Design a protein around this nucleic acid. Structure first.
Lengths: 316, 316, 316
DNA sequence: ATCTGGGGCGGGTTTTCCTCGAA
RNA sequence: AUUGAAAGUUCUGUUUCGAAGAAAACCCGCCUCAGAUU
């Protein structure tokens, strides 16, 4: 299990919308409960959805899987991620539907061989015999840091025109700036492993053979999100990202580091790691820290220089 | 017993749900009566049910029990907590239904030797000779702090789209952010102890042999609930939790600490505990406290640093 | 005597139920006539029967009596309060039925030496020679405050499901919130005193040797009701209680303070007690008050911080 | 400080289960 | 002060035990506030 927390800094940005009113495009905003000296307050703040990062991760995964020779589905060959939700996707792909519960495992394995994305990202098929498979990577919204008494985020509107020579052409676009943060989780101890209960079926040998390649590709995929390649409306509103602080941890037991809200969240997670290992009887716990803002770190933890090093270390 | 109150601060989550209408998901909400500066009011507020916590705790218990070698049932090997209620579960597990009341103790012991969950989580079998075993852990809904006049909570809806290349795929999801608090109860003096009244039957010696391990595992299992690992929709809506304040108490007599609504429930509960012992003539009464929001505590009480230390000390 | 009236604030609660319909579990309800500024309205409101409170009190009494060293019956040691109604209870307990009227008194003594519960709570025996004994503690339903024209109380349904892997399991439960109130009476000058008229019988001396202990235990047993331990469905719906106002009166003459339906029920009851002492030729009268909602009280009263102090002073 | 432009379109959810028993 | 006068149908009892609405998905593909002035 690889878990992590990341702090980005974004200026003059619009990477997600919700709808439009009149001739105005709306950024995504949501409530937050914040703590200050006086007490508890409710504020509205711009956020970036969690399904605008899963899409980027899955796209990078598809690209790398195609480049390295691993199988990739038909619909997912194009960047459409209906996977196998409905009967039409199955018919196009070329798989048969489950007959009864006993056969369910069979079907899954087939689906889990044709398309890599349906394996690391989970899926759901609804029919007379439904089948489910939860994701192997988990994500959440991207909120700015709820630190201190002043949220360091701003939102505004801008006025734009479309030139013409025969007037008979004006639009307003929302733009935001923030100190974003988020956290992520990936469990590599279940990749290429059926999640349904039943007797053994043929074809699992190929899965056992491909497990190493699949895990390596999935780990490599995270470089997309960690680098800052995601979101929409990038053509004319390319943002200016920058990495401030990152903490990642590899363990054998469930564990989640502190959110990036407080200035001192590197130290607390490191301190808690060893005690968690002791209480839960673990056998491996390592932590990697990337720091550029100059805050408290701790002791007995690696210090890297760039994200590219972390991917290599995780692969090793 | 071990009884405690906990205060949480969650942002932008959707943990519990209920039936949906149209293309919109629903977050569990309930009515609450609140005291104001002008009287008493009825409000509607989001709430996280009390059985999601039970499922998370029992899943953690299953994991640790299987890790440490304690017996675990067959159906409960998978996470299907029907337990020995319906006849099909007994038939799968291989136990004969009781004949008369005189056989109740035999059935209870035989079931309790096969499944730790059916022991530390109670169970019920309905039939000609009904058998009951009340839970040894007790939990309730998770309500936001009913303090003052302004409830610190907020619930909104969000817009999501499933992109495609051949339009012919839109949904809305509710998202909340609140300051959650809840209380929990447990009793270690009844684990590995048959409840029904009868004559000693063989095998209870083994029950007495494993009591220490069962109690240790049950105490360890709480770390899952205390660390923030529960609820659904965690794949794409991973919350951002944080622990503000916590009080836990180990005693020898019935005792329920003050809810975490008012600002000062630590000093009040410690003062009440100081006198309850003398009132009921106990012999052990210890209190542990974690304080991050800087509220009134008292003097001469333990001040821990995390939840791992609390679990370690409770184990000792 | 000791009389009292108490006010509670309960949220997200289900402590009493009745016959169910379909997959719906119901909360007990009853009619109430409320006088509003427009007239006399009739409403339906959730109520909790008094026998639940009686059962909780008697269970606490059994626990304390066993722990202190007073006699306790055979069946009642297992928390089954049939007392001595039917012949089977006598046969298990090992006592002889009365023959005729003149012998009845003897019966009442023996049963009153073998079980403190049959002493405090009374009993009945249908048969040739009835032996009645009115309870020494009296309680009534728990109705929410009828202050004003807007009753603070709400009753809703909630939806729950049982997970399974092979569908072939859905239930609904009623949850409530309200501001409850209830009143209680307990005359301590009739404990350990035969209540049937006849000649003296041996063993009454032993009864008189334990009167102090029996009375003290009966007083201590009220800590349960005054702390908030009663009802059912406490395993998964642990309610969040809190005490707001309480009035207790210790006297030598019949008295019944004001029902806690009006914001000013403390001053009125204090004045009524003051005048009743004079009118009834009484000799002792004291009033204790616990006040947490900051309402008007009066002058010349004792204010207690918690229930522990109240029980201590009642015992002293 | 004088004008003129002030948005267009495709999509607006699919499944599985709807209470067991003692009085 | 009347078919009136004289009377309690009263005592004893839990609806209790257990069960995740969970799994899958991008609001996104195009546009300039431009021309003249001490």
């Amino acid at each position: 299990m690889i878990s992590g927390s990341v702090r980005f800094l974004v200026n003059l940005e619009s990477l997600n919308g919700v709808e439009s009113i009149g001739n105005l495009t709306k950024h995504r905003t949501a409530p937050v409960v914040l703590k200050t000296s006086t007490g508890y307050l409710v504020r509205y703040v711009p956020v970036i959805s969690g399904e605008a990062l899963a899409h980027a991760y899955q796209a990078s995964l598809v690209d790398i899987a195609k480049k390295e020779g691993l199988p990739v589905g038909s619909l997912s060959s194009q960047y459409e991620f209906i996977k196998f939700s409905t009967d039409e996707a199955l018919k196009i792909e070329g798989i048969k539907e489950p007959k009864d519960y006993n056969d369910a495992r069979r079907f899954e394995v087939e689906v889990m061989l044709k398309d890599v994305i349906a394996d690391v990202g989970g899926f759901m098929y609804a029919g007379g015999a439904p089948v489910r498979r939860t994701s192997r990577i988990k994500l959440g919204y991207m909120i700015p840091a709820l630190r201190g008494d002043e949220i360091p985020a701003q939102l505004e509107a801008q006025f734009h025109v479309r030139f013409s020579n025969k007037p008979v052409a004006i639009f307003n676009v929302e733009v935001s700036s923030a100190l974003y943060t988020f956290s992520f989780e990936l469990d590599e101890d279940l990749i290429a492993v059926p999640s349904t209960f039943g007797e053994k079926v043929k074809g699992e040998e190929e899965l056992e053979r491909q497990k190493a390649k699949r895990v390596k590709s999935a780990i490599k995929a995270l470089y997309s999100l960690l680098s800052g390649n995601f979101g929409g409306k990038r053509s004319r509103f390319l943002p200016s990202m920058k990495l401030m602080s990152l903490v990642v941890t590899k363990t054998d037991f469930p564990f989640m580091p502190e959110p990036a809200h407080d200035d001192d969240y590197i130290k607390t997670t490191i301190m808690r790691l060893g005690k968690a290992k002791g209480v839960l009887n673990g056998n491996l716990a390592k932590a990697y820290v990337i720091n550029n803002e100059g805050i408290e770190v701790g002791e007995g933890v690696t210090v890297l220089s760039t994200v590219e090093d972390l991917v290599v270390k995780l692969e090793e």
